Amino acid sequence: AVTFPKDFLFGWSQAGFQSEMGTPGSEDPNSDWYAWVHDRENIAAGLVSGDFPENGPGYWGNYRKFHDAAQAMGLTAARIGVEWSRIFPRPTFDVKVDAEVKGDDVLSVYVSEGALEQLDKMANRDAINHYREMFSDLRSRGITFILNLYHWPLPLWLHDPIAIRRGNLSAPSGWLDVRTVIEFAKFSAYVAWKLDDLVYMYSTMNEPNVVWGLGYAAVKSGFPPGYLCLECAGRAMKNLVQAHARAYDAVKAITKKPVGVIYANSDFTPLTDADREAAERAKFDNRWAFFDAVVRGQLGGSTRDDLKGRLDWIGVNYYTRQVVRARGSGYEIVPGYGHGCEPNGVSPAGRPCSDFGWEFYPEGLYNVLKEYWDRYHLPLLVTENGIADEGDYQRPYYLVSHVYQVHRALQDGVNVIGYLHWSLADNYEWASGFSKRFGLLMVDYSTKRLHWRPSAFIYREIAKSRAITDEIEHLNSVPPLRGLSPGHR
Amino acid sequence: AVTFPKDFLFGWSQAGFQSEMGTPGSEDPNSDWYAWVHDRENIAAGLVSGDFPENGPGYWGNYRKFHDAAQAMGLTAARIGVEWSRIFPRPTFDVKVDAEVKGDDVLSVYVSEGALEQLDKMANRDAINHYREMFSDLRSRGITFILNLYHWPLPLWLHDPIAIRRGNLSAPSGWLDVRTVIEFAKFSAYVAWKLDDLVYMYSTMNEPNVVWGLGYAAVKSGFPPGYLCLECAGRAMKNLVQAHARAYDAVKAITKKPVGVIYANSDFTPLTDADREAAERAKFDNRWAFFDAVVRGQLGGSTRDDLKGRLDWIGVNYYTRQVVRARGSGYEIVPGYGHGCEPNGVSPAGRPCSDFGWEFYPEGLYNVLKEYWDRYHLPLLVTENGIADEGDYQRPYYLVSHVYQVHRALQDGVNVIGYLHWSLADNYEWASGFSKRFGLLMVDYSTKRLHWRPSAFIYREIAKSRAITDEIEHLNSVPPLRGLSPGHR
Amino acid sequence: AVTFPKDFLFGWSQAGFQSEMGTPGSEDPNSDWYAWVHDRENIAAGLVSGDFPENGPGYWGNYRKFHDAAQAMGLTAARIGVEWSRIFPRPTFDVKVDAEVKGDDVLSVYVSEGALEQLDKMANRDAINHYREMFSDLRSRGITFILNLYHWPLPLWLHDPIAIRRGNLSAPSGWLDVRTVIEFAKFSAYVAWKLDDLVYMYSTMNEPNVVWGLGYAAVKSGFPPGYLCLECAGRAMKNLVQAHARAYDAVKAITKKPVGVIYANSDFTPLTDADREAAERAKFDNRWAFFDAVVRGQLGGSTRDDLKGRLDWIGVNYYTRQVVRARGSGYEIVPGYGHGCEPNGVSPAGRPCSDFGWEFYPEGLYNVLKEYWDRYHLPLLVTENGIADEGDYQRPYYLVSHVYQVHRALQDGVNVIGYLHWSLADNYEWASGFSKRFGLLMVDYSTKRLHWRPSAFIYREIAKSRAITDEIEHLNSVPPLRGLSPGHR
Amino acid sequence: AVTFPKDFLFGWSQAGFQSEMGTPGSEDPNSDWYAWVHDRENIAAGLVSGDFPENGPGYWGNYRKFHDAAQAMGLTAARIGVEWSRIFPRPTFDVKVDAEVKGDDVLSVYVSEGALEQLDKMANRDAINHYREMFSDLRSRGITFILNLYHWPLPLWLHDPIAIRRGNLSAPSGWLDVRTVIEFAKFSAYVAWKLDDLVYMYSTMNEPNVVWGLGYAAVKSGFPPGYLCLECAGRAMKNLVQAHARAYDAVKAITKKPVGVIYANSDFTPLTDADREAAERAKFDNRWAFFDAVVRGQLGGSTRDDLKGRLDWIGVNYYTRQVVRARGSGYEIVPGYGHGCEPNGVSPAGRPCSDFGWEFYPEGLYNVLKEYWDRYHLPLLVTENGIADEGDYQRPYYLVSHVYQVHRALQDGVNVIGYLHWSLADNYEWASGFSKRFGLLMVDYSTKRLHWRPSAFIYREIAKSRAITDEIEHLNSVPPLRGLSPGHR
Ligand code: NA
Ligand code: NA
């Protein structure tokens, strides 16, 4: 068997927007992402799927049954998001805080108790009370709670993504506006102040790199505001860095619990040995630039004491690799591997690809954990790992293989404190809608019933034993190719 | 949930030759099938895989661990074969019995206690003692035992399949020789006399239709003796009919426990409504001819009182359908469906096909059960159902779907007493060797370790609950096609 | 054999931007499309392929060899475009014309001889002289010349597509600016005045529906300006309508030769009989709205005498169908058929799909010809038909099948005057770059050599015989599926 | 261009049994192969396709139209077989010849003029006259005629393949009987005596290695007599060796024209460098053993002066490779490459596979030509090369690529005198029936009409120019994979 420490957390991760809606009274129309996915032009263009979150799995109303399944599966942790748009559907700009802003730089934001009380007057009571209700129930099952403050949607009062798509940059502009940083510090302080007693650890945000990169560079992804603007991507990145740091400080002024960040990762692997330097450039550009900012204070060639040391733990999201080849002194991501594969194809390495076109590459999780550990030596939590797999064809192998790699990291001395699968149940996969199914549990979106895929039973074995048991270790292997789609050659 | 009666048996089936060998001291070289699969000409022709049973899963030595897994899975029954070649590696012809033989017809075989004692003197002691040991352990787990007397291999002294392949029909000729019928009655009496205290129910033989049909007609299958001879097929069929009847009588002279037969089935479905009569002809020719003989005494246009009423229960093996189309007043099996599909392809009905090229068609199990019930109203046991599936891609759906159909049969009044999956573990699939993997448990043929596929955990849910539980009912559905091989169009 | 009239034209069509560049001295950087495909953000987003036209097949320099191949193939006609950006790389706004503009409506544009002389002073001499040189050579081979004035790129002084993408709608805005209509009338008059002696028939423009629809609605296509704006699509459509009418009048003031238009078509086929009305709505919205404007003067619910009767012939481009299903009182295009298929897949109708994901549907060409004929009874020319097919797998069948359908139309009384394949040679396929290969001739983009695919030899048979000969009629059939990619199911 | 010598022959090869029947009056029921393919047991087993030759392409009646197409294609040679079963449907045993037989060895057979006259009295006049008629017409088109005496079927009086399949080895036993050698010498002498004036070169037999190997070893191929017997394979091989030598001598006693043999070849390529010796063993066992016998007189370790020097030219048939890996001091053919691939799959080398599962490997034709040349330095004729390809997907590339390799051999000094494609038209592919379509011309088996595939037009280019012209040289390349079936991985 492959045995984990007694205190190692097995659980799941979940986003508010992706999972909450679907039950009566849950609809939240007040976010940029809601507007974005309902926008007729976006639907007609195929930027978004045409599926809508309000037809989703209904965690808002049915949380007890999600928690029942998690408890039955032996899970001991959950990272779940709260939605800013639910808690502050109306603007909080008028709440005075003590901020130092020098042009583009937000160096401090102090949120007084008076400000928290004013925020409480503005907050949506049903929302914050309901979050307490859900997370209280979660805790009642023996499940430790990691609260993630931000998982992409913004209140519409902060971001009109359609106006921005259209190039009206004077409209509310989300992460292009330093004001969003200050408002986020306010929000973060408020939520900690309200909910801290339920929380084990905090994450300020999830995959900010996806927000800046898909929002403003990889616009065919269909993410808001879909305004093709590399300078905007950089501005958003910096504001997300600053938002993280200012949220960290705001939360720390309320609680001393660990405050971290969750980030989207790939293992950047060189196509050939000659591409090793190119792979290193890719790691820096796509990963270290953000973490060097929030850990070491290093941003854009300058060091900021207000950014340094603003991280207690790192949430590693990992799905697959990106293969890199040198292109002059730059680099390029090689199609056909990693994230860039044919849906339900096979890479040139002989690795099957998911329903999303993501290559089976569990080794990359070890590499990414090791690399973050060696660089910063901050505690790591695998905050997402999973697969879009409607048939549960690859998922059993994917699960076991990736868990094994976490164990390997641990054996080599990486302080990884848990593994959170994405996700407990199927949910609304952003611009792709419902057809990308990442659950251990299948969701019937008509009935809202949860259904156990066989992988869920495998995960129960792991979580209850805190081990890859002898019975299931064989799943630490690549899915046999013959029975799977071959893709195209 | 889909709930079964309290006394309904969930278990597995297993053959001696397919599963026993692989551990030191287990090798049995004294069968036609052993000779057949080691024959250099057959190997070179690709008639047989070149894999050998002596490299198999090792039930002979490792039975306790098979039983441990079955007990852990909640299984309550097993149908397991004994090998005639192990028990009587030397000829028993000289043991006198009271038989009435009129040309091709064996009308009676009475095996006296003197004959049983003489047989006991000739029997391989290690073999019979070891069978008692294995089956005693099986019973000690709360597993009811259905003993199947014959599952294809014959002692070499009864059948030299290479000599027969070569057309030397004066060599020992297996089921072409009426003497084999008499020897089988002797064998059957002996085994019942020795082992009855361990047995719940008996089956005389397994899939005799495969023996006659693959042996002498469908010779590309690579089954012994591979002597293309339709008249021989008919002779073998009749002798298997007579062997069943004479074994039934011999066993009944020793024990009053139920004695049945296990047979290979397909649902014969008409391609179009115009093919309904053709499908009925196919059912008669391939199924009813045998059962009308051993139930109703009707064989070849004549009725035999020595054949009538020689059946207490029917073991239904079922894997897939055969699609039938009329061809004049005859019929033909349509390629691309049923047993005749592309390995890991998809039929024109949109049903995925297994590693063996067998179509996903759970509805056929209901139909076959219903049809046998309506015709004979004898108790039915699903004695085999499973899938060659190295990835466990289709098996979870296959399992649940077929179990559901058994429940449907029950609800409609069919007396089906249990469901036995083929198989607990991977084993030697005849001419195909080890590459066709039917287990709930994967076998590592190097280490002989058993490994739980996710389907095994699904089956544990079913067996322990005696139900398709709410958590797994969704698997009563067709595997999603997109992720699977499409085959060729 | 399937025999065509003696005067029926077999030829090819070709665009300037797609085919001209690739030889030294040919580069034309002064178009919106050039800027668009070189834009780093567009490249990084995958909106455009990253391939560049200046690496293309080099018709500008190598035209004689294209013409040699066409002449060897027996071709008797070519529709070839001229590029406005080459002829007027600097703005022509200052040239005074007599135009009546009432808000959004351009009711007349009269281009005097003084204006033509002023335009001649501004025109790029090398460009216009080189067009005369190329088209003179074309004519010297016995090839009749259909001149198409516009095939998507605009001079950069008329359209900064990057500024528009960014939402700076005060930048030069192409077909969003009524001034572009007037400038197009000037251009059209100039080219006719210069080149008329070489021209058999004129087309004002090619596939204006692609320009408005891909430019402003189907933005994932990666066409300029890629500004998602349905209102803009409508504005561009109207301006293209007006541009056509004003160009028609301007050309007719110089020459009485036939002036037509070339348009992108699909056969809109109903998924079920219940979708017939929905298919009719799709035809109107996607096809008749434009032609009713330029034939009948009907636009937006009002009739314009300045639009009525501005068409002498219709160029039918046709590649595949679109399957339509009713959606309430609207309709939707069904994925998996027509233009919306898996590249190198197979539709649910069993029709193979091209390298572009376009379904094999030759019957639609008959339907589209018949429908245009029945509605307007204007002479028809099949101005494009072809397939992206790097292996020449489907093309031989595609060619013969579609030619057959043209013959069927003719037999039923449609006045179709010729068939022009897209294309003689591989070329730059817009946002897809060079990897979509539509040639009868393969282009080696390194050497610029032309290579005859087997389909080219088939087309020689057709063109030289003016018939589908008995030897090749069998190619009027669907490509056999077994050897082709199956796609995914 | 790739230019061939002025006298280099481009043509086709054709078998009597495969192509003759299909027109009224052509049926020849008097051969082992006819009996074999009509045998109900063989049909039911799937040994044979169930298709029958009497439904074939009808060369017997329609030869003029085959010749018309060949002449239109510029072909200058044909190798066509005559059928012994047609010419001597009744036994010739009684015709006395002067033979020296020492047990298994036929050392001489002298056929006197008296014997030839007696044979003429026994010969089927219609048959021999019709062969003269067909071959006279062939010659009248400028087509040189290579007569092949034997192409597998035997008269039924010489071989009852069903009796042999059944193991009745006292029945007429074909190449297991030395008498067949003597009868073949008689036949060969007779045909030369009758037809010599029409013949340029003779071949005694075609692919005798297929006859012995498929007949008696690779019995799943469904070739007669399908009697699995390695000793019989060896006996048949020796008798075919002796038949060749005795036919050579008999024909040479009548004519001094060149007498050769046609043989089935593969390039035996080592999987890894470590397998080079194994590949050499495979070449000897499968190729050199036969040629060392008929060239060098070396057979079975002894040298026979009556076998030495009995070859004037070698007909190289070539379709694909066989990949070889060492297995101890022996070797094995690696599945997935060469002849052993998935139909319409792709090998691990990235080479597409035909409808027969044969890998695209043109390089092997060079290798095989070079190897035969270096060993024996006898003139070579590529007597077959082609592909089963119903869509003409791979054939254009296959044709050009293999012709190129012949040119390469020539450039390196191999005396290759021509290239004969298999085949002009589709025909009856033995146990596979009509579904394997090797023609440059497609045959409609209902109408018997011939249809030109595009490859036929490519071959016309080659044959008329005696060159791979600049226009078609690009087809010397591997078919692009994306559009083709990927097979399974
Ligand atoms: Na699975
Ligand atoms: Na082709």
Sorted by sequence, the CB contacts under 8 Å of residue A8 that are 6+ apart come out as: A410, A417, A418, A419, A466
Give the ligand with the smallest distance to the CA of C400: 2
Instruction: Establish if B168 touches chain D: CB-CB under 8 angstroms.
Output: yes
CA–CA separation, B213 and B225 (whole Å): 11
Angle at which helix B395-411 crosses helix B363-376, to 10 degrees, equals 30
CA–CA separation, A208 and B261 (whole Å): 66
The C residues from 390 to 419 touching B (CB cutoff 8 Å) are: none
B486 and C482 within 8 Å at the Cβ level: the answer is: no
- Counting every residue written for chain B, the total comes to 489
Q: Structure tokens of A339? A: 């994230």
Give residue B153's region: left, alpha or beta (phi > 0; psi -120 to 50): beta
Q: Which residues of C are annotated as a binding site for Mg(2+)?
A: 392
Closest C-alpha to C247, from C328, C200, C320, C184: C184
Q: Which residues of B touch D45 (CB under 8 A)?
A: 217-220, 228
The beta strands (E) that lie in B36-121 are given as 77-81, 98-102, 105-110
Give the ligand with the smallest distance to the CA of A394: 1
Instruction: Establish if A479 touches chain B: CB-CB under 8 angstroms.
Output: yes
Q: Which residues of D touch B41 (CB under 8 A)?
A: 217, 228-230
Instruction: Establish if C486 touches chain B: CB-CB under 8 angstroms.
Output: yes
B452 and A471 within 8 Å at the Cβ level: the answer is: yes
**Residue B392 annotated as part of some ligand binding site:** yes
Distance B393 CA to ligand 1 centre (A): 4
Which residue of D lies nearest to B484 if distances are taken between CA atoms? D488
CA–CA separation, C313 and C318 (whole Å): 16
Query: Which residue is associated with the tokens 């005559």?
Result: D82
C-alpha distances (whole Å) from B332 to each of B213, C191, C366, D8 are: 16, 70, 40, 51
Q: Structure tokens of C30? A: 């002064």
Which residue of A lies nearest to B455 if distances are taken between CA atoms? A454
Q: Are strands C380-384 and C314-327 parallel, antiparallel or unpaired?
A: parallel
Closest C-alpha to B236, from B312, B285, B178, B194: B178
Instruction: Name the CA dihedral angle for A270, A274, A280, A282, rounded to a multiple of 10 degrees.
Output: -60
Burial C208-233 (b: 16+ CB within 10 A, else e): bbbbbbbbbbbbbbbbbbbbbbeebb
Query: Which residue is associated with the tokens 């599962």?
Result: D357
Instruction: Establish if D45 touches chain B: CB-CB under 8 angstroms.
Output: yes
Determine the 3-state secondary structure of C175 from DSSP: helix
B483 and A444 within 8 Å at the Cβ level: the answer is: no
Q: Which residues of D touch C455 (CB under 8 A)?
A: 454
Q: Residue D319: in which H helix or E strand, if any? A: strand D314-327
A484 closest CB neighbour out of B472, B474, B485: B485
CA distance C140 to chain B (A): 48
Under 8 Å between Cβ of C417 and C10: no
Sorted by sequence, the CB contacts under 8 Å of residue C145 that are 6+ apart come out as: C77, C78, C80, C135, C138, C139, C198, C199, C200
Distance A454 CA to ligand 1 centre (A): 7
Interface test with A, best of B71, B354, B358, B392 (most A CBs within 10 A): B392
C350 and B489 within 8 Å at the Cβ level: the answer is: yes
CA–CA separation, A155 and A56 (whole Å): 20
C481 closest CB neighbour out of B350, B482, B489: B489
Distance B450 CA to ligand 1 centre (A): 18
Q: Residue C247: in which H helix or E strand, if any? A: helix C230-252
Under 8 Å between Cβ of C219 and C161: no
Which residue of A lies nearest to B485 if distances are taken between CA atoms? A485
Sorted by sequence, the CB contacts under 8 Å of residue B242 that are 6+ apart come out as: B105, B106, B178, B181, B307
Under 8 Å between Cβ of D90 and D23: no
CA distance A445 to chain B (A): 13
The β-bridge partners of B298 are: B303
Determine the 3-state secondary structure of A68 from DSSP: helix
> Which amino acid makes up residue B365?
L
Q: Are strands B298-299 and D259-270 parallel, antiparallel or unpaired?
A: unpaired
B41 and D167 within 8 Å at the Cβ level: the answer is: no
Give the ligand with the smallest distance to the CA of D454: 2
The β-bridge partners of A268 are: A322
What is the per-residue DSSP string for B111-132?
--HHHHHHHHHHS-HHHHHHHH
Query: Which residue is associated with the tokens 């179709």?
Result: C416
What is the per-residue DSSP string for C13-62?
EE-HHHHS-SSTT-----BHHHHHHH-HHHHHHTSS-S--GGGS--HHHH
The A residues from 335 to 354 touching C (CB cutoff 8 Å) are: 343-344
A344 closest CB neighbour out of C169, C228, C488: C488
Burial A428-450 (b: 16+ CB within 10 A, else e): bbbbbbbebbbbbbbbebeebbb
The beta strands (E) that lie in D348-482 are given as 380-384, 416-421, 441-443, 450-452, 467-468
The architecture (CATH level 2) of C1-489 comes to Alpha-Beta Barrel (3.20)
Q: How many CA atoms lie within 13 A of A223 on its CB side?
A: 22
A486 closest CB neighbour out of D350, D482, D486: D486
Q: What angle do CA C389, C391, C395 make, to 5 degrees?
A: 50
Domain boundary assignment for chain A: 1-489
Sorted by sequence, the CB contacts under 8 Å of residue C172 that are 6+ apart come out as: C156, C157, C158, C159, C160, C163
> Which amino acid makes up residue C129?
N
Closest C-alpha to C320, from C347, C281, C285, C280: C347
CA distance D290 to chain C (A): 36
D344 and C483 within 8 Å at the Cβ level: the answer is: yes
Q: In this complex, how many residue pairs, one in chain C and one in chain D, have their CB atoms less than 8 Å apart?
A: 87
CA distance C385 to chain B (A): 26
Give the ligand with the smallest distance to the CA of D483: 2
CA–CA separation, B408 and B412 (whole Å): 6
Closest C-alpha to A291, from A324, A226, A338, A244: A244
Which residue of A lies nearest to B343 if distances are taken between CA atoms? A483
Q: Could you count the other beta carbons within 10 Å of the beta carbon of residue C205?
A: 23
Q: Using alpha carbons only, how large is chain B's radius of gyration in Å?
A: 21
Q: Which residues of C touch D452 (CB under 8 A)?
A: 471-472
Q: Which residues of A touch B489 (CB under 8 A)?
A: none
Q: What's the farthest any 2 CA atoms get from each other in chain C?
A: 65
Alpha-carbon dihedral sign for residues D217, D218, D220, D226: negative
CA–CA separation, C440 and B72 (whole Å): 66
A40 and C230 within 8 Å at the Cβ level: the answer is: yes
A41 and C166 within 8 Å at the Cβ level: the answer is: no
CA distance B441 to chain A (A): 9
Which residue of A lies nearest to C484 if distances are taken between CA atoms? A488
Sorted by sequence, the CB contacts under 8 Å of residue D52 that are 6+ apart come out as: D37, D38
Alpha carbon D48 to its chain centroid, in Å, reads: 19
CA distance C294 to chain D (A): 40
Closest C-alpha to B37, from B356, B427, B428, B431: B431
Closest C-alpha to D93, from D155, D47, D36: D155
CA–CA separation, C66 and C58 (whole Å): 10
Q: Which residues of B are catalytic?
A: 384
CB-based burial of residue B478 (10 Å sphere; 0-12 exposed, 13-18 middle, 19+ buried)? middle
Q: Where are the alpha helices (DSSP H) in B169-288?
A: 178-195, 208-216, 230-252, 276-283
Q: Are strands C77-81 and B105-110 parallel, antiparallel or unpaired?
A: unpaired
C458 and D454 within 8 Å at the Cβ level: the answer is: yes
Sorted by sequence, the CB contacts under 8 Å of residue C465 that are 6+ apart come out as: C1
Determine the 3-state secondary structure of B327 from DSSP: strand
Alpha-carbon dihedral sign for residues C308, C310, C312, C316: negative
CA distance A479 to chain D (A): 12
Alpha-carbon dihedral sign for residues C413, C416, C417, C421: negative
Q: Are strands D314-327 and D330-333 parallel, antiparallel or unpaired?
A: antiparallel
Q: What is the 3-state secondary structure (H, E, C) of B356-419?
A: CCCECCCHHHHHHHHHHHHHHCCCEEEEECCCCCCCCCCHHHHHHHHHHHHHHHHHCCCCEEEE
Q: Which residues of D touch C456 (CB under 8 A)?
A: 471
B451 closest CB neighbour out of A344, A471, A485: A471
B220 and D217 within 8 Å at the Cβ level: the answer is: no
Give the ligand with the smallest distance to the CA of D395: 2
Q: Which residues of D touch C66 (CB under 8 A)?
A: none
Q: Which chains touch D (3 or more CB pairs under 8 A)?
A: A, B, C
Stated resolution in angstroms? 1.4
Alpha carbon C212 to its chain centroid, in Å, reads: 13
Q: Structure tokens of C423? A: 């294309």
Distance A393 CA to ligand 1 centre (A): 4
Give residue D280's region: left, alpha or beta (phi > 0; psi -120 to 50): alpha
Phi, psi of C136 (to 5 degrees): -65, -40
Q: In this complex, how many residue pairs, one in chain A and one in chain B, have their CB atoms less than 8 Å apart?
A: 87
- DSSP code for D138: H
Instruction: Establish if B454 touches chain A: CB-CB under 8 angstroms.
Output: yes
